[PDB]
Design a protein around this ligand. Structure first.
Ligand SMILES: CN1CCN(Cc2ccc(C(=O)Nc3cccc(Nc4nccc(-c5cccnc5)n4)c3)cc2)CC1
Length: 452
């Protein structure tokens, strides 16, 4: 059907105007003139958006079939079919190397004594239009031949089970949306920092707006992985979260956000202003962070990297949640976490660190640890304890004690955040209200000392 295409691979949406689809999905594309990105409309979901043109095939063509591998050699088909995880009966169809115009069905098999091997069955074509492996069983299409042998082996080594898996190709360039800006609209002014994955600058946007510009060093993480952070920030908008302004999706990749003039909360606490802060100021900062996290909570997201180093500060003790580089929408299943997500370990709840169960409740644990950073003015959690020993201690019941000059009621709040069972930890909704009302509802007799 001309203008109908079939997806060869899965594609996940990563902008506001691209289209998610699954392999085998049928899509209308009425202008396939060119570019590497085509406007498509799904005949399954009725959704419209842009798709990578190398991920689809015309619906008429044999190339639309997932099991059709075209012109590959006998030996290359074997290499693909002998993948360690393929079930017995994994298969593909390809051109025959030995008979012009014929095809070949190649199938993974298993010898109980000798192990994995591949069998090949030549598919010949008649003048009548038929296809066959054996003369007695003919079909009008490769599709019907495959369908039949997926029901019964009928002479083959095994019934056809699984279509041979293969590598998904990269898209040609990244999908872009209305957050994209021309790089000429930016001037880099002051370099704020740098690390293994790039740099952060203070700059100006459109000649008028002060911004922070996070840059990706090429050859480190993928542009897609880097921009996951911007994808999250397009959806999460709140006064106590750092705001996304724009992206530049060609190398070097930029993420452009609002600029927070005082830098990280950790450095702010350790610096000269920390000496002049007392409990009311620190609790107010905690409440602001809790308000941001209560929004993240309501929106069904998880941050996964909450700590004072990832809060940013402005004038007048304004605090905002930042660094959404690990943040995720919560899904009702498990996933294999990256080895790096659990670090730094002193902020990570045991069930997140041990089993990869990162939830809003593991963010609550991290918030409790953040409360210790506030009340000690930036001391490292678990002082005297090396990173390698922390998990075992916490698992066995060890909790940090009440910091000097910290009211017992605030340490009791920290301890609730560190409950062994995640469900027994408070919500950020509760934490925000508690901290906002602290000096009227909880400590109405408070008087400052020299530190808190
Ligand atoms: C161990 N690790 C090694 C690599 N290193 C890189 C680094 C170091 C310092 C800063 C900093 O002081 N930033 C700073 C200073 C003054 C103001 C701001 N303001 C600001 N405003 C908005 C966004 C951002 C920002 C910061 C970091 C990442 N992305 C956005 N920063 C930032 C930023 C990045 C971090 C530590």
């Amino acid at each position: 059907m001309v203008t109908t295409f079939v997806a060869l691979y899965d594609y996940e949406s990563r902008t506001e105007t691209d289209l998610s689809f699954k392999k085998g999905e049928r899509l209308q594309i009425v202008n396939n003139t060119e570019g590497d990105w085509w406007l498509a409309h799904s005949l399954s979901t009725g959704q419209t958006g842009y798709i990578p043109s190398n991920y689809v095939a015309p619906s008429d063509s044999i190339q639309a079939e997932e099991w059709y591998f075209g012109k590959i050699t006998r030996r290359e088909s074997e290499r693909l079919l002998l993948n360690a995880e393929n079930p017995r009966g994994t298969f593909l169809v390809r051109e025959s190397e030995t008979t012009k115009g014929a095809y070949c069905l190649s199938v993974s098999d298993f010898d109980n004594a000798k192990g994995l091997n591949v069998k090949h069955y030549k598919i010949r074509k008649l003048d009548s239009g038929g296809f066959y492996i054996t003369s007695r069983t003919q079909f009008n299409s490769l599709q019907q031949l495959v369908a039949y042998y997926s029901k019964h082996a009928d002479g083959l080594c095994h019934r056809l089970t699984t279509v041979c898996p293969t590598s998904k190709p990269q898209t040609q360039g990244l999908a872009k949306d209305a957050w994209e800006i021309p790089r000429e609209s930016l001037r880099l002014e002051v370099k704020l920092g740098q690390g293994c994955f790039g740099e952060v600058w203070m700059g100006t946007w459109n000649g008028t707006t002060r911004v922070a510009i996070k840059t990706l060093k090429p050859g480190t993480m993928s542009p897609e992985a880097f921009l996951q952070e911007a994808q999250v920030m397009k959806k999460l908008r709140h006064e106590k979260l750092v705001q996304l302004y724009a992206v530049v999706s060609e190398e070097p990749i930029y993420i452009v956000t609002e600029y927070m003039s005082k830098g990280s909360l950790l450095d702010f606490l350790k610096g000269e202003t920390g000496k002049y802060l007392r409990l009311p100021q620190l609790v107010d900062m905690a409440a602001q962070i809790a308000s941001g996290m209560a929004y993240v909570e309501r929106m069904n997201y998880v941050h996964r990297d909450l700590r004072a180093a990832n809060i940013l500060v402005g004038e007048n003790l304004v605090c905002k949640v930042a660094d959404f580089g690990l943040a995720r929408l919560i899904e009702d299943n498990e996933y294999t976490a990256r080895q790096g997500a659990k670090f730094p370990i002193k902020w990570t709840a045991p069930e997140a660190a041990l089993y990869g169960r990162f939830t809003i409740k593991s963010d609550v644990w991290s918030f409790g640890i953040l409360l210790t950073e506030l009340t000690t003015k930036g001391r490292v959690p678990y002082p005297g304890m090396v990173n390698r020993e922390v998990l075992d201690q916490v698992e066995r019941g060890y909790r940090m004690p009440c910091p000097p000059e910290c009211p017992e009621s605030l340490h009791d709040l920290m301890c609730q955040c560190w409950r062994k069972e995640p469900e027994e930890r408070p919500t950020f909704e509760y934490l925000q209200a508690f901290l906002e009302d602290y000096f009227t509802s909880t400590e109405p007799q408070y008087q400052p000392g020299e530190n808190l």
